Amino acid sequence: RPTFYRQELNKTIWEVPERYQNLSPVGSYGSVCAAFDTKTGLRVAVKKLSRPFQSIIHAKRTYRELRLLKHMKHENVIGLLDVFTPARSLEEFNDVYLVTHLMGADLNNIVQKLTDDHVQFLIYQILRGLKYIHSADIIHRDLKPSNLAVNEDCELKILDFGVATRWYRAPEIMLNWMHYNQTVDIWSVGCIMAELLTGRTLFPGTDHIDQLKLILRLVGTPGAELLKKISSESARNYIQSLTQMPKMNFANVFIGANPLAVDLLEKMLVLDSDKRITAAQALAHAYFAQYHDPDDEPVADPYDQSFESRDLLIDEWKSLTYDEVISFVPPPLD
Template sequence: METRAHFTREEINSTVWEVPEKYTHLKQIGTGAYGSVCSALNEKNKEKVAIKKLHRPFQSEIFAKRAYRELRLLKHMKHENVIGLIDVFTPALSLDDFQDFYLVMPYMFTDLSKVRGQLSEDKVQFLVYQMLCGLRYIHKAGIIHRDLKPGNLAVNQDCELKILDFGLARSTDAEMTGYVVTRWYRAPEVILNWMHYTQTVDIWSVGCIMAEMINGKTLFKGKDYMDQLTQIMKVTGVPGPEFIQKLDTPEARNYVKGLPRYPRKDFSMLFPRASAHGVDLLEKMLVLDGDERPTAELALEHPYFDNLRDPDDFPEPLPYDDSHDNDTLSLDEWKRLCFREVKSFVPFPRRDSKRKNTLTMSP
């Protein structure tokens, strides 16, 4: 951790950035409700990075808790298909003047929401494989992402993919809430607001994204929640009584019972450009009942990935310790926890990908 003397200060789009002097050429590349992101060059190793500055992380207990959770999750992730931390720093020398911290991550070329049109089967295969490798790791750590969508999947020019944005990810055992995933990629059990869904909500999202890459258009483009559910049922077919019994509320059960009797569509007709194995994988992921969908680990055993599968892609994570996720702490306590996490950061030696890949990506 460098001292304040080795920091430079500049204003970028009305936001003050104080960063170690080794980071130069800052340029804003994104902004949102919770922070801004700049690309930068690390002069020591000439590596291009993305630096995220959280927007006033200690303005309230809720913001501070969210900042703490994001920092902890990013520190935990050590897989080449999941975004992780290269560095974390604060210009503050002590807890008393600790107001901001910055997260340094690998710079990525673009994200899948900016990649337009149909993709070739080998690209789809490689990208979906990487999504599932990343999800396998996340899920084995005990985390559900819950917000998988094209905009949260960063890709480099060589088609290497990283899962982004754990702002809304919660540990598997935490209480579930219904308003998380961007609607078009949201699993039906989330729309129906079950309280106890599982990691297979992320598998549904992968199915939606895979379908979009194959056909070049969004699979389920609902205008609202109920329209979204209707669009889904028109493809999956209306469920039988076993599924309906699993629904938590009488309202959800009555709504599904009242739907027209849509039959399940023929996926080979729906995805004429996909191979037989690709169609089969989509059929398994886009199943209405989350209990019937494969886990990420099981999906990776599918023949669709026979030419890609490599044991090195499946490292075992440590379980994520979410002991503070449900705590109600004071602002000062959250601040102290964040400061401790920033100060205790140790860089993880990142593995260069050994995957043989000749694919290229252009938005």
């Protein structure tokens, strides 16, 4: 066990290993401090979870967050440098702190007027991380510029938790489809890419009804092939009742963009999610010609999501979390 030290940071009592020095609050789910990690000489983010075990729901979320972070080992996905608690046993375990690399800024923070070459590289790395995430049978579901961290070097990582979420949300989620799949995240990337190319939010809906309206304006109203797959009578009838909007020609919307970027946008922003390009397929698209390497786009180890279907007591989730803190193995130095 390391020596721990205590301090007050903007209302909170932080108790951290001596390893982490010069804590400096950066934002407040829980709050975050920048720190110097004396073990590596790198700046790190230390996140103290707020009330991690205060309900069955908080408790399972805490476990979920730790399981996910522990799993991610990819250059374009946030990973866990450390997890620790000041507690010496399960019985006094009440606090969890998570340590990750400190990233420069978020993609929202860097959006003024982006060059096509920057767009290629940034979207490439998003798709590379998503390939990896999706290969674990995980759906991010909340991809938006504030959940993407970027270095000054333009290196990007997808974050679990860092502008309205809805603006980036696939139409099938707004419509409450229970069986939406991983291409919801490709929809989101499409929305992000469009925004990077034009400097404007592609769909700034004021709410979900407005959001779908703006969406169908561009992608047009569902064809016969999509309608016959919609299990909800009310939703199909609603969809079918709207004024028929033809799909816009994207060349006439993203005027002057690289035609390859326009073409990839066409394959991402397909209304029918069964026809949307996957992350793995997007990577091989011609737009990423100067970056794509089929031998350096790895997939993830399988991830056991079976706890998701379990209903456990608070102390059991809390105990499973403690087990995960105890079994944590630091990533290799350098």
